[PDB]
Design a protein around this motif. Structure first.
Motif, PDB file in Angstrom:
ATOM      1  N   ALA A  69       2.065   1.832  -3.164  1.00 40.94           N
ATOM      2  CA  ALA A  69       0.871   2.175  -3.933  1.00 40.94           C
ATOM      3  C   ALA A  69       0.524   3.666  -3.886  1.00 40.94           C
ATOM      4  N   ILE A  70       0.697   4.308  -2.730  1.00 36.62           N
ATOM      5  CA  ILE A  70       0.465   5.755  -2.663  1.00 36.62           C
ATOM      6  C   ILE A  70       1.720   6.549  -2.998  1.00 36.62           C
ATOM      7  N   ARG A  71       2.886   5.979  -2.712  1.00 39.56           N
ATOM      8  CA  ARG A  71       4.128   6.660  -3.041  1.00 39.56           C
ATOM      9  C   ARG A  71       4.399   6.593  -4.536  1.00 39.56           C
ATOM     10  N   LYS A 125     -15.992 -47.131 -48.400  1.00 39.82           N
ATOM     11  CA  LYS A 125     -16.378 -47.085 -46.993  1.00 39.82           C
ATOM     12  C   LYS A 125     -17.729 -46.394 -46.789  1.00 39.82           C
ATOM     13  N   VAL A 126     -18.031 -45.417 -47.639  1.00 42.20           N
ATOM     14  CA  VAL A 126     -19.350 -44.799 -47.628  1.00 42.20           C
ATOM     15  C   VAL A 126     -20.401 -45.842 -48.041  1.00 42.20           C
ATOM     16  N   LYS A 144     -13.217  -6.693 -35.549  1.00 39.05           N
ATOM     17  CA  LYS A 144     -13.351  -8.028 -34.974  1.00 39.05           C
ATOM     18  C   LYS A 144     -12.110  -8.915 -35.186  1.00 39.05           C
ATOM     19  N   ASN A 187       0.843  -1.185   0.000  1.00 36.80           N
ATOM     20  CA  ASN A 187       0.000   0.000   0.000  1.00 36.80           C
ATOM     21  C   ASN A 187       0.873   1.227   0.000  1.00 36.80           C
ATOM     22  N   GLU A 188       1.980   1.121   0.730  1.00 31.80           N
ATOM     23  CA  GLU A 188       2.916   2.222   0.882  1.00 31.80           C
ATOM     24  C   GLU A 188       3.493   2.625  -0.469  1.00 31.80           C
ATOM     25  N   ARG A 216      -4.290   9.937 -17.918  1.00 31.57           N
ATOM     26  CA  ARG A 216      -5.079  10.938 -18.633  1.00 31.57           C
ATOM     27  C   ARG A 216      -4.217  11.769 -19.592  1.00 31.57           C
ATOM     28  N   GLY A 255      -2.466   6.595 -10.907  1.00 36.31           N
ATOM     29  CA  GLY A 255      -3.542   7.536 -10.653  1.00 36.31           C
ATOM     30  C   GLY A 255      -4.076   8.137 -11.937  1.00 36.31           C
ATOM     31  N   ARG A 256      -5.133   8.933 -11.824  1.00 34.67           N
ATOM     32  CA  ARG A 256      -5.884   9.386 -12.992  1.00 34.67           C
ATOM     33  C   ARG A 256      -5.079  10.234 -13.966  1.00 34.67           C
ATOM     34  N   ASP A 286     -13.184 -38.691 -47.662  1.00 34.51           N
ATOM     35  CA  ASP A 286     -13.603 -40.070 -47.435  1.00 34.51           C
ATOM     36  C   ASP A 286     -13.380 -40.900 -48.679  1.00 34.51           C
TER      37      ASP A 286
END
Lengths: 141, 143, 145, 55, 63, 80, 67, 206, 70, 60
Positions: free
Chosen positions: D5-7, D50-51, D29, D2-3, D17, D12-13, D46
RNA sequence: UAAUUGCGAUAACGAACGAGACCUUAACCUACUAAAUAGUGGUGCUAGCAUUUGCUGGUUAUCCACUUCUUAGAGGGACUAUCGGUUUCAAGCCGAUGGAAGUUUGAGGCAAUAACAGGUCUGUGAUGCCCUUAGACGUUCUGGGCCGCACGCGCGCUACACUGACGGAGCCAGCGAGUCUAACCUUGGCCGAGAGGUCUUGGUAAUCUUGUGAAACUCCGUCGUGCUGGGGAUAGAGCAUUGUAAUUAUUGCUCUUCAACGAGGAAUUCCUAGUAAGCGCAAGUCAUCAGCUUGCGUUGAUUACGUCCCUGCCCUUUGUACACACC
């Protein structure tokens, strides 16, 4: 007993049952007079039958009408049909035929489905849309 | 000629009866009036501020008078309305039950209603009396 | 209701709580343009302060105004249900306040600044300038910042 | 954690952006193999005996 | 303004590739004894009254 | 004792679908010609005085690309 | 559209052909006749048949019709 | 009026204006003609009604739409722009209001004035898109009387709606203005404008 | 805020001395005279109706209607 | 009318075609004042496969 | 003609599958059989107001009677009937009248022959082959993830208000569903602003929830055209409920914060009558969660009743060196 007939009037699902005996000239709906029945903008819809046939004619009969089902408009039309049908039933049974036929003739010559029960009914929705015909929505690609 | 309340037009009867319990003074109006909202499905509190408890009381009296017996929940479902879920569709949701119930007890003390068997409140004979009385009054306003 | 008259005792526009309130607008709906009080709170207080809701903002007397400010920045004392209050349980001293005007800004700041200072995911989320209440972010808000 | 993560910036946005939208974010597609459908990949086929035996 | 009024006397067909215009022959009523085929827009039947604002000019095939 | 079972012969095997499906199933499981199996089945079903009959066979026989075969004799209706 | 099916008009044909010494230009008695003469599994079918053999009955009364 | 009464009572002027003249909300139904050739047969008025509400069916046959009471043909063509799809009580009521307003200003039967707003704004001839290969031209056409009615009501009510948008006045008042100005053409009404335009074009390309 | 929100004395006298010639009066007719918001306009109607000029020939909310005294 | 509404498809593909099955429950009751034997006799016999019979005595 | 639906022409004649028939549902029945699990009239018993008789209720059985309304069994009923326009005076179609109903009566269920390498081995203890099978691609346990966010696209939901928001007050539906080896639908009484808590109760159900007192909507107010009291995004704080568990916040509640959106470019979907659209339910899913769907009723318009211009597809004529059939 006394002379008395009972009738009805339907609009959509709303059924309106009507007791019509011989009396001093009351006309009640559910438990309250015809001078209510609000909507009230549509007051003259149920007023109508007693004006088409002259405001007398009731001064020897008594009417009460209980309504179930339907919405508001449904019930208003239901009870006016009920009352009209009622009066003509009473004259079919107790007065005479020329009068019953004269009241029928005075009604139908104007009408709003007063003696004839409108058969308009809701249609089933089918899968594919929010309606009976109305399909949902496509984008192709 | 005689009279019930089925002979007076709701808003007439209820306005009248409202001004009557107003003109009286014996009511028991808990106190939280003006701060309460009558329903979670509502925005502001009642615009009447001073009053409306009389209006709701009269409405309740009238309505319970019509039929057999009716509890508090029926008055929630009755006074329940359209809640705006902001950006989500409206659903119907019941009104307050402390308001309704306290109105029942406040119209039970002042003798217009009574905890009948089958549950629910039943219109009182003295209630029949007075309601029909002010009915005669309100009609007689337009003599 | 009534036809009134008055001389020059009403003033349009007037300043209180370090913010300006229009005079030619109903009192309730007037002192709503104060960041902290809303239509509900305002209504209840106006009712409490012994003032007629029918009066415009600029109509009132001075005494009424002062009493209004008082009642607003003193809720639990003049009897208001605490659950009618925006800031219950101050998360430090525990008392119930109703943060008003220039303060509510500073309080937003406060709470946020607690979150981030504790480094909780809501802190990390408010630091990232993101949707913070667990909403889908794939499709919503393509301007914002 | 977390540390970080904020440091740790690049996060962030704003930082996203200010970057640029890749061209494969508004494409198609991609399809790949379709008009081929009826023609067998197997390339084996085939055999009429065989058929004639099986059916 | 010499506004003209003519009664529908027949129903001929539906011009235009869309099929909204209805080919129909009409006969005036202020001074009868002459007929002009005209083209309408809306829903029409026999014995209706068209307000012609062009006394002498008729039409046929539409595309 | 709450339950009692009774084995009972069915009249005309050649008018029950299930019986015939089972029939040809065990025909082909005994390694009989597909055509001869279905044709023999339809024959027996018809000779039991049925109005009409049919046997669809869908799957793969010795080949690799699957196929299907209808064998129907007599009168059948399909709608309503 | 009320184009009567083949089975209907066929039946009506046969019936007029072999029971003209009966029937009429009246639907009711032709329907009832149909019930006393033709085994029909449906009311609706029988009314379609009777109505068509009725119309044919009317239009034979003012000239011949093929078949 | 030789009054009758019984148990449950019916008000005086009520009994009166009911059994006597079978008029509208409470307005004169006779007199009133369509001030124009054609339009008759396609504009109702008689047989008379009370309120423009009805269990009617005018859609099950091609032209039977033209026998409905014209006032209700006005009221129906109110209740829309989506948020009013249905809601005929709203329509009926605002129609009563409107009639009252119209009748208040410059008198006359409001119903008659309605006839005069229908008759005028109905375009006598219009135009249509005719191909002739790619670059299409515009062929004038002597539009039917029935479509003249329909287009009249459409123009009137819609114009009234756009005019009642985002402004203090009500649908009743704006509608009233759009029937008053369109009693006899004033070109300060939406409908008369649009009609006159369609005829300008219909004659320009002919 | 754009005017017509109060009761400036001679505004009341304007109102008193302008309802003649008004073939029709209502809320949307009161406002149209470059004056009075709907609150004070409804109040204007209801008070002027206590005695003077405007004749009540219509009923309820959303829609007001009056005429002139004769 | 016991209804059931279902996609006809085993998978997800296809135009969304729904299907509605139903089973119909008809329920009758006959009130008889009688002794002991005739009831037992009438419940012993008149037995039908498919028709479910239930024989109550009761009065409260 | 909706129809290889018919008429007619005619080397064809008379048929069979398919369409039609049929089945299901909504419509008609003061005609039959009935019913305290449906309801009506009278009588008891009783309250209120009038009082002159009356008007308006109460009393899961106090009796007697009934079957108009309700319910579901057997029947009847429409066959585009009667008349008249129009066409090879043929099939039919149009209009008036009557009628519960005259657009296949309205809406569905089924539905032949043939094709597609359409979709489904992620429904199956349906299955060929291949791969994996003990450091498992078996299974189970913990935690996380399918919800992750510069952005493109499709179904939607809520809105831009004055045919409106708000607050009082009036007050009306139809399709459903509900607890045995269990805790489902829950009236009622208290407690709380609310959500909800708590004390009891009816109902395995036409009997109880429930008249499902739903919402648009009706009525009297308040606001008064101003990003306003229209609009409710984002967000802080507090209370509750489901659940072993709710942080990335299941849901519900209360206060505050008060965004974009001033009718929307090119384009494009759906729809012809109780249909469109507006409005809310019930059911599925479900411990908790509908902005979804399947059905349902409520309010109830406008515009056609036409055509082949755009499109899509059928049908003949014609060409063919294709027939594994223009992939």
């Amino acid at each position: 007993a006394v002379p008395s007939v009972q009738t009805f009037g339907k609009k959509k699902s709303a059924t309106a049952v009507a007791h019509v005996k011989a009396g001093k000239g009351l006309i009640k709906v559910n438990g309250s007079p015809i001078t209510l029945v609000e909507p009230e903008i549509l007051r003259f819809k149920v007023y109508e039958p007693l004006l088409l046939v002259g405001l007398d004619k009731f001064s020897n009969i008594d009417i009460r009408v209980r309504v179930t089902g339907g919405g508001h408009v449904s019930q208003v039309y239901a009870i006016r049909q009920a009352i009209a049908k009622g009066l003509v039933a009473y004259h079919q049974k107790y007065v005479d035929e020329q009068s019953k036929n004269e009241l029928k003739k005075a009604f139908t010559s104007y009408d709003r489905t007063l003696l004839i029960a409108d058969s308009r009914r809701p249609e089933p929705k089918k899968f594919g849309g929010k309606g009976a015909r109305s399909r949902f929505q496509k984008s192709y690609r | 000629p005689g009279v019930s309340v089925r002979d007076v037009a709701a808003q007439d009867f209820i306005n009248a009866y409202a001004s009557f319990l107003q003109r009286q003074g014996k009511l028991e109006v808990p106190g939280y009036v003006d701060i309460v909202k009558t329903s979670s499905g509502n925005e502001m509190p009642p615009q009447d501020a001073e009053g409306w408890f009389y209006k709701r009381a009269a409405s309740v009296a009238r309505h319970i008078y019509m039929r057999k017996q009716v509890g508090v929940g029926k008055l929630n479902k009755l006074y329940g309305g359209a809640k705006s879920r902001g950006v989500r569709p409206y659903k119907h949701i019941d009104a307050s039950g402390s308001i309704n119930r306290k109105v029942l007890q406040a119209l039970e003390k002042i003798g217009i209603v009574e905890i009948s068997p089958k549950g629910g409140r039943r219109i009182s004979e003295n209630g029949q009396r007075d309601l029909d009385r002010i009915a005669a009054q309100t009609l007689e306003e337009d003599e | 209701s009534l036809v009134v008259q008055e001389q020059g005792s009403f003033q349009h526009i007037l300043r209180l709580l370090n913010t300006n309130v229009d005079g030619n607008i109903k009192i309730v709906y007037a002192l709503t343009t104060i960041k902290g009080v809303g239509r509900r709170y305002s209504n209840l207080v106006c009712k409490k302060a012994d003032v007629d809701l029918h009066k415009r903002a600029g109509e009132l007397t001075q005494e009424e105004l002062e009493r209004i400010v008082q009642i607003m920045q003193n809720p639990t004392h003049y009897k208001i249900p605490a659950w009618f209050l925006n800031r219950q349980n101050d998360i430090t001293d525990g008392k119930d306040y109703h943060t008003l005007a220039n303060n509510v800004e500073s309080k937003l700041r406060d709470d946020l600044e607690r979150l981030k200072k504790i480094r909780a995911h809501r802190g990390i989320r408010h630091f990232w300038g993101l949707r913070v209440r667990g909403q889908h972010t794939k499709t919503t808000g393509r301007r914002r910042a | 954690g977390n540390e970080g993560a904020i440091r740790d910036k690049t996060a962030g946005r704003r930082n996203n952006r200010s970057k640029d939208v890749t061209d494969s974010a508004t494409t198609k597609k991609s399809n790949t193999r379709r008009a081929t459908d009826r023609h067998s990949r197997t390339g084996k086929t085939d055999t009429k005996k065989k058929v004639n035996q099986g059916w | 303004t010499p506004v003209t009024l003519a009664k529908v006397i027949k129903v001929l067909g539906r011009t235009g590739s869309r099929g909204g215009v209805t080919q129909v022959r009409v006969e005036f009523l202020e001074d009868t004894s002459r007929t002009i085929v005209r083209n309408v827009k809306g829903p029409v039947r026999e014995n209706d009254i068209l307000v012609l604002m062009e006394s002498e000019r008729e039409a046929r095939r539409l595309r | 004792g709450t339950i009692v079972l009774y084995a009972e012969r069915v009249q005309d095997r050649g008018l029950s679908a299930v019986a015939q499906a089972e029939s040809m199933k065990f025909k082909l499981l005994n390694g009989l010609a597909i055509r001869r199996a279905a044709y023999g089945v339809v024959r027996y079903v018809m000779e039991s005085g049925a109005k009409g009959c049919e046997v669809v066979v869908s799957g793969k026989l010795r080949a690799a690309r699957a196929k299907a075969m209808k064998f129907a004799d007599g009168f059948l209706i399909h709608s309503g | 559209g009320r184009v009567r099916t083949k089975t209907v008009k066929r039946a009506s044909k046969a019936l007029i052909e072999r029971y003209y010494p009966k029937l009429t230009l009246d639907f009711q008695t032709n329907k009832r006749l149909c019930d006393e003469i033709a085994t029909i599994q449906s009311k609706r079918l029988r009314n379609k048949i009777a109505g068509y053999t009725t119309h044919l009955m009317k239009r034979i009364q003012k000239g011949p019709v093929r078949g | 009026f030789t009054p009758v009464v019984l148990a449950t009572p019916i008000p005086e002027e009520v009994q009166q204006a009911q059994t006597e003249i079978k008029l509208f909300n409470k307005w004169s139904f006779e007199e009133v003609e369509v001030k124009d050739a054609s339009l008759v047969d396609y504009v109702q008025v008689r047989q008379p009604i009370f309120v423009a509400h009805t269990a009617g069916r005018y859609a099950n046959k091609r032209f039977r739409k033209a026998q409905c009471p014209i006032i209700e043909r006005l009221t129906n063509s109110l209740m829309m722009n989506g948020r009013n799809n249905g809601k005929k009580l709203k329509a009926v009521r605002i129609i009563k209001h409107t009639l009252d307003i119209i009748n208040v200003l410059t008198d006359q039967n409001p119903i008659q004035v309605v006839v005069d707003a229908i008759t005028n704004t109905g375009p006598r001839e219009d135009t249509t898109r005719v191909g002739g290969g790619g670059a299409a031209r515009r062929q004038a056409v002597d539009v039917s009387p029935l479509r003249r009615v329909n287009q009249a009501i459409a123009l009137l009510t819609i114009g009234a709606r756009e005019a009642a948008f985002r402004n203090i006045k009500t649908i009743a008042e704006t509608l009233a203005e759009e029937l008053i100005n369109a009693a006899k053409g004033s070109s300060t009404s939406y409908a008369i404008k649009k009609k006159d335009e369609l005829e300008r074009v219909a004659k320009s390309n002919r | 805020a754009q005017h017509a929100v109060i009761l400036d004395q001679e505004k009341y006298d304007r109102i008193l001395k302008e309802v003649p010639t008004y073939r029709y009066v209502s809320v949307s007719v009161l406002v149209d005279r470059l004056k009075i918001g709907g609150s004070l306009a409804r109040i204007a109607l209801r008070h002027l109706e206590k005695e003077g000029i405007i004749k009540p020939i219509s009923k309820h909310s959303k829609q007001a209607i009056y005429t002139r005294a004769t | 009318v016991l209804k059931i509404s279902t996609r006809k498809t085993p998978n997800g593909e296809g135009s969304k075609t729904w299907e509605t099955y139903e089973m119909r429950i008809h329920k009758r009751y006959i009130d008889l004042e009688a002794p002991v034997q005739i009831v037992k006799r009438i419940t012993q016999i008149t037995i039908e496969p498919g028709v479910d019979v239930e024989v109550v005595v009761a009065s409260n």
